[PDB]
Design a protein around this ligand. Sequence first.
Ligand SMILES: CSc1ccccc1C(=O)NCCCC[C@H](NC(=O)c1cncs1)c1ncc(-c2ccc3ccccc3c2)[nH]1
Ligand SMILES: [Ca+2]
Ligand SMILES: [Ca+2]
Ligand SMILES: [Zn+2]
Length: 369
Amino acid sequence: GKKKVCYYYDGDIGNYYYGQGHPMKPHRIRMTHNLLLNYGLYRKMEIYRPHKATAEEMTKYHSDEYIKFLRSIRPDNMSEYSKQMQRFNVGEDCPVFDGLFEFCQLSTGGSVAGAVKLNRQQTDMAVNWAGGLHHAKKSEASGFCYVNDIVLAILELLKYHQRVLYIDIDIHHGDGVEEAFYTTDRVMTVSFHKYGEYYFPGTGDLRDIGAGKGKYYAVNFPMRDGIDDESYGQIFKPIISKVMEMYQPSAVVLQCGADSLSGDRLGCFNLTVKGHAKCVEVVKTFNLPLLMLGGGGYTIRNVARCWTYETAVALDCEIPNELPYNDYFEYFGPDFKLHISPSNMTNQNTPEYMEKIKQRLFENLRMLP
Ligand SMILES: CSc1ccccc1C(=O)NCCCC[C@H](NC(=O)c1cncs1)c1ncc(-c2ccc3ccccc3c2)[nH]1
Ligand SMILES: [Ca+2]
Ligand SMILES: [Ca+2]
Ligand SMILES: [Zn+2]
């Protein structure tokens, strides 16, 4: 029926600045919080402030060398660590900024706290919008991510769950999560993303299905520019339903990257908030312990709308399209509405392409015991 939702948020998260012109804007999490608070969602869920994850917690997946570098690097001592910066991919994409390590601790802290809270059966859904940083590697930062909170949270769930299902609806391929569990059947990583012609991160081919004991436990749905609600909607439920039937998981982690929305400054997809939220509703019908994370998103007004609505969906709460007054009301102009309209962009994904990729995916799903 209606489930218990635990929400994680640190009031300071919005103060971390990546640098002038960088598209990663932590302020989008404070806009999200302010919007869902202003709609009255605080009355229906538990709000918790996440702890600052320790180097011990982070090293359950990451190397000590990489975590020690992260916990010591600063804009002032930058010149000293020139070699280490290159080794760990800290530079233009993943800059060195004031409070970098603290930001990682808060982002991670909520994901691991949600996994613990779910493990103890104290909640049915845990939400951490500051998490979902799917590109971070064992000893390397990548695509604005430094610590892979998702991998750490999955490692936490694996303590009480034999099989965990990871679903990634960000526009980019969830490389870091896929790589972490590429050779195990204990975690199945299913990712829907845009693919081809030097599009970040370069990975996510349909033919990438896992290795060793993890062969057939890595699923990838490569899409082209312009995918709409209708096209995405016809593939998501059938793939997820088959993955549930064959894989039979006991816990689910769903990364909700909003960079797959219409008009995103870094994305080329054309989903609306109702189309994006349809994925949360689909996953929610299986009534399995669920951890909901954030991820991509540069058009911060659309990110705030999307995650406010997906929190409402998780609560089975109907909220009006008319936006309530809030601390960032001017960002949502000139409509001041919660829902967004799709653009006139061409959907390169022909329905036949969608059905062909889906067919090949189901072939691979037949290979599970
Ligand atoms: C959407 S924000 C997000 C939030 C949470 C989790 C994930 C994401 C995400 O999708 N991250 C990946 C985004 C793509 C990275 C992509 N980079 C590359 O392709 C390569 C880099 N090095 C070699 S190739 C990129 N797209 C735009 C820029 C960019 C633009 C302006 C900048 C101005 C200042 C400084 C840096 C900047 C980086 N970089
Ligand atoms: Ca994805
Ligand atoms: Ca796997
Ligand atoms: Zn992304």
